[PDB]
Amino acid sequence: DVPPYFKTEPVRTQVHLEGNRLVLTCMAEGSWPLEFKWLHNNRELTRFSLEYRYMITSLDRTHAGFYRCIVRNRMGALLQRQTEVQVAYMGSFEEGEKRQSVNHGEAAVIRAPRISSFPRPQVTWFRDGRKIPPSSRIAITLENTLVILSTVAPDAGRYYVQAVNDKNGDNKTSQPITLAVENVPADPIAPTIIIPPKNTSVVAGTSEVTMECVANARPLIKLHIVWKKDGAPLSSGISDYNRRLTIANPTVSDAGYYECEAMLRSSSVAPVTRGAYLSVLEPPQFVREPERHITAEMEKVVDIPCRAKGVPPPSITWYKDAALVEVGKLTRFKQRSDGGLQISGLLPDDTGMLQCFAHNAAGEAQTSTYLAVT
Amino acid sequence: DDVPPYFKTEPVRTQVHLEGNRLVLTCMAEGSWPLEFKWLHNNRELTRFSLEYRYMITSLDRTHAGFYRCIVRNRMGALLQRQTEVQVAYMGSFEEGEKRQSVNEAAVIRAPRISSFPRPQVTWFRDGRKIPPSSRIAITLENTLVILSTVAPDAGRYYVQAVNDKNGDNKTSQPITLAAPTIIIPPKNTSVVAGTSEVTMECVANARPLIKLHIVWKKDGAPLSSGISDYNRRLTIANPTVSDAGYYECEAMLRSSSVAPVTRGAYLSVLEPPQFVREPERHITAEMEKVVDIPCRAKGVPPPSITWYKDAALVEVGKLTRFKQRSDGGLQISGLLPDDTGMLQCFAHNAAGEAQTSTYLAVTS
Ligand SMILES: *[C@@H]1O[C@H](CO[C@@H]2O[C@@H](C)[C@@H](O)[C@@H](O)[C@@H]2O)[C@@H](O[C@@H]2O[C@H](CO)[C@@H](O)[C@H](O)[C@H]2NC(C)=O)[C@H](O)[C@H]1NC(C)=O
Ligand SMILES: *[C@@H]1O[C@H](CO[C@@H]2O[C@@H](C)[C@@H](O)[C@@H](O)[C@@H]2O)[C@@H](O[C@@H]2O[C@H](CO)[C@@H](O)[C@H](O)[C@H]2NC(C)=O)[C@H](O)[C@H]1NC(C)=O
Ligand SMILES: *[C@@H]1O[C@H](CO)[C@@H](O[C@@H]2O[C@H](CO)[C@@H](O)[C@H](O)[C@H]2NC(C)=O)[C@H](O)[C@H]1NC(C)=O
C-alpha cells in the first residue's frame, strides 16, 4: 500500500528521424495494480492499462509534440513530466522563380525561399554554380537571407539556394531568383541599417547566442558598425565584419538592450541606430517543497508549501491525483502568493497525491506529496 | 576562393538512439572548394577524405556505440569537429542461470548479469509477489537485493524483472535460491555534472536487533538532516553544485550497549565542463622566422587540460624546438616558417566534456 512514484523522468526534448521507431516509457513503481495512461498535447491517447509503453513504429512529422503519462493505483495518481518529441524532417522548396530589383549602390535583399524543415537547414548561396561566401560586401543572415551591400552592374543575375538539414542529411536546391540593378557613376550613399537586431530569447547555459546587424553605405570601406549594450560600447564577441555579436555562455546579466549603430568614418554623416532586447532565461528550481508524506487530522486546516525561482518568475500550478485543482471555485482550497496550497476543513476525500508544477518559458519542474487524512 | 573552413553548427555532446533505427551524422562546415570530409570513430579512421559530409547508419547496432567526429578540409587547412558520443539503447538476455546461496544475519543477493544500456530498472519478486523496500529489505543503486534480518520464512527463490526505459524491453531472470552493526553497502565514490537534477549517496547497514540500528549522514564531519530517505539508506542532493562536493560519511550505531559505531565514507565530485576565458582572434598574422604567441585559457572542475592541433593533426610538443606550450595553456611558435600557415585549433578538455576554439594563422612573406 505505497503511493506511486517515478523511478525516472524523461528528458525535456527529443529529436528523432522520420520513419524511426519511438518508445515512450512510464517508469513508475508502487503497489499493484499500477496502471498507466498516455497523453499527447494534453489530450488522451489511451485509457488506463498495464501497458507502461507508448510506441510509434514509424515516426512522422505529425507525431511531433508533447507527450506525458499518468500513473495510478488505489492510493492515487501522478502526472509525468512532459517530454517534447521533435521529428527531424525536410520538405521541398515551395516557391518558384522570382524577380527582384535594386538601385545602384543601394542594398539588394534576397530572402531564402520558404521551405518546411526541422530543424532550420543550413543554407549555401549560389550564383551560376558558384558558391557565394560571406565577404566585405556580401552578408548572409541568421534567417539565411542574402544581402548584397553595394550593388554594382555585374551583380545582376540569378541566385539560388542549396539547403541542408543537419539532422537527417537532407539536401535540396531551390528555384532561381533574378536580381536586376537599375540606374547603373558613383556618389556617396548615407549609412542605413538593412537587417536590424531582432528580439532574441535564450536559456542560460547554452553554448552561444548571437545578435546580428547588417549595414550599408557608399563607400562601404568607410562604413563602421558599433555594438552597444545599454548605451555602452561592446568590444568583444564581434565578428563577420562587425555584423555579428556573439555571446558565449550567456547569463541573466547579459540580458538587456543591444543596439547596432552604423556610421561613416572620416565623415560628418550622423549615425543610424537600431536595437533589440536580449532575454536570458533560467528554468524553475524549487526553493521550498512539501514533505514526501504529509499526515493531517480531519476537519483541520493544512498548509502545503511550494515556492520556486526562475527567470521569468515561474507560475505555480497544483494537481490533485493528476487533475487540476480549482482554487477559484472551492472555498476550502486557497492558493498563497508564494504558491503554497491551503486546504481548510479537511475531508477524507482529500486523501491522495498532490502535485506541484512550476512552469516558465525556460522549462518545467515537478514535486509530489501524499496527503493522508486521519 | 580564399576562405578558411569553419563550422556553421556543432553536434550535441551526447545522443541516445535505439537499435535498428537510422543515424545521420552531419559535418556542417563552410569554406572554399574543394571542401572534403573524413569521419572518425573513437579516433580511428572510418572514411577517406571525400565530398560526402554525411555519415549514415541505416541500422544502428550496439557495436556502433562510441565517439564520432569529423575532419573538414580544403586548400586553406583542416578542422577537427567536436566529438559526439553516440550511445545505442539495447537489452540482451539474462546470461546466468539458477544459483544457490545460503545465510545463517543479512542475505545479499546480486541481480543477475544482463547486457543492457542503459542499466534497467529492476523489480524484485518472491514467489510471484513483488517485494518492495522495507524496514528489513533494501534495494541498492546497483540493483542488489539486501535482506537485513533473515528469518525462516525469508528463505526461498528470488528473481528479477528488469525493464529498459529506452526501448521498453522487459525480461525475467532465472530464480536465485537463498537458504552487531555492520556496513554491507558502503557509500561509493560519485562524480556528477551540475544540473543533473539529482545525485545520490547510499549506505546500507545491518544489525540485530535491527530496530536499534541508526544511520547518521555526515558531510566533512558535519551532520546532515536533509536529503535523507529510504530508512536512512539514501542521501539525495537535488541540483548538485560544486559547493556540494566533498567527503560524505555513513555512520551506523546502536542506541544501546557499548558497541562502537561503524563509519564508511566516499567522495562526491561535482564537475563543470570547460569554458573558455581567453580565446585567440579569428585570424592571427605573424612574420617569418619570428615568434608568435597564441593565447588559450579555460576554466572547469577539475581544471581542464589544454591541447593544440594544427589542421586536425596533433601538434608535436615532443619536438618543441619551435613549438612551446605555456603553463597557462598558450601556444608559442618560434622561427615561423611558411608551412605553419593554416588552421590552429585549441581544445580544452575535462571529464565533464570538451570545448574548441579555432584560428587561422597566416605567415607573411
Ligand atoms: C521587443 O520586445 C520589447 C519588449 O521587451 C520586453 O521588455 C524588456 C525590458 C525585456 O525585459 C524583454 O525581455 C521584454 O520582452 C518591445 O518593446 C516594448 O516593450 C514595452 C514593455 O517593456 C511594451 O509596453 C511596448 O509595447 C513594446 N513595444 C511595442 C512597439 O509594442 C519591442 O516592441 C519588441 N520588438 C518588436 C519588433 O516587437
Ligand atoms: C574514492 O576515491 C578516493 C580518492 O578520491 C580522490 O581524491 C579526492 C581528494 C577527490 O579529489 C576525489 O574526487 C578523487 O577521486 C580513494 O581514496 C584512496 O583510499 C585508499 C585507501 O582506501 C588510499 O590508499 C589512497 O591513497 C586514497 N587516494 C587518495 C587520492 O586519497 C578511495 O579509496 C575511493 N573509494 C573506494 C571505495 O575505492
Ligand atoms: C547537394 O546535392 C547537390 C546535387 O543534388 C550537390 O551538387 C552537385 O555537386 C557536384 C559536385 O561538383 C556537381 O557536379 C553537380 O553539378 C552538383 N549538382 C547541382 C544540381 O548543382 C551538392 O554537392 C550537395 N551538397 C553538398 C554539401 O555536397
Residue numbers in the entry:
A (entry chain A): 3 to 186, 189 to 378
B (entry chain B): 2 to 105, 108 to 182, 194 to 379
Article passage:
Sdk1 and Sdk2 are single-pass transmembrane proteins, with extracellular regions composed of 6 N-terminal immunoglobulin (Ig) domains followed by 13 fibronectin type III (FNIII) domains, and a relatively short intracellular domain terminating in a Postsynaptic density/Discs Large/ZO-1 (PDZ) binding motif. These four domains adopt a horseshoe conformation, like many other IgSF cell-cell recognition proteins, but they interact in a unique back-to-back anti-parallel manner not previously observed. Overall, our data suggest a model in which Sdks form cis dimers on isolated cell surfaces, which dissociate to form trans dimers through the same interface when contact is made to a cell surface expressing the cognate Sdk.
Two crystal forms of Sdk1Ig1–4 were determined at 2.2 and 3.2 Å resolution respectively, one of Sdk1Ig1–5 at 3.5 Å, two of Sdk2Ig1–4 at 2.7 and 3.2 Å respectively, and one of the Sdk2Ig1–2/Sdk1Ig3–4 chimera at 2.7 Å resolution. The second panel shows protomers from the two Sdk2Ig1–4 crystal forms structurally aligned, and the third panel shows a single protomer from the Sdk2Ig1–2/ Sdk1Ig3–4 structure. The dimer protomers are related by crystallographic 2-fold symmetry in both of the Sdk1Ig1–4 structures, and by non-crystallographic symmetry in all the other structures. Although the Ig1–2:Ig1–2 interaction is present in all of the crystal forms of Sdk1 and Sdk2, there is a difference in rotational angle between the two horseshoes of the dimer among the crystal forms, with the Ig1–2:Ig1–2 interface acting as the hinge. The Ig3–4:Ig3–4 interaction varies from the Ig3–4 domains forming a considerable additional interface—as in Sdk1Ig1–4 crystal form 2 (915 Å2 BSA) and Sdk2Ig1–4 crystal form 1 (1294 Å2 BSA)—to being splayed 14 Å apart, as in the Sdk1Ig1–4 crystal form 1 structure (0 Å2 BSA). These differences indicate that there is flexibility in the interaction between the horseshoes in solution, with different conformations being trapped in the crystals. In addition to these major interfacial regions, the Sdk1Ig1–4 crystal form 2 also shows a small contact region between Ig1 residues E11 and R83 and Ig3 residue E212 towards the center of the horseshoe dimer.
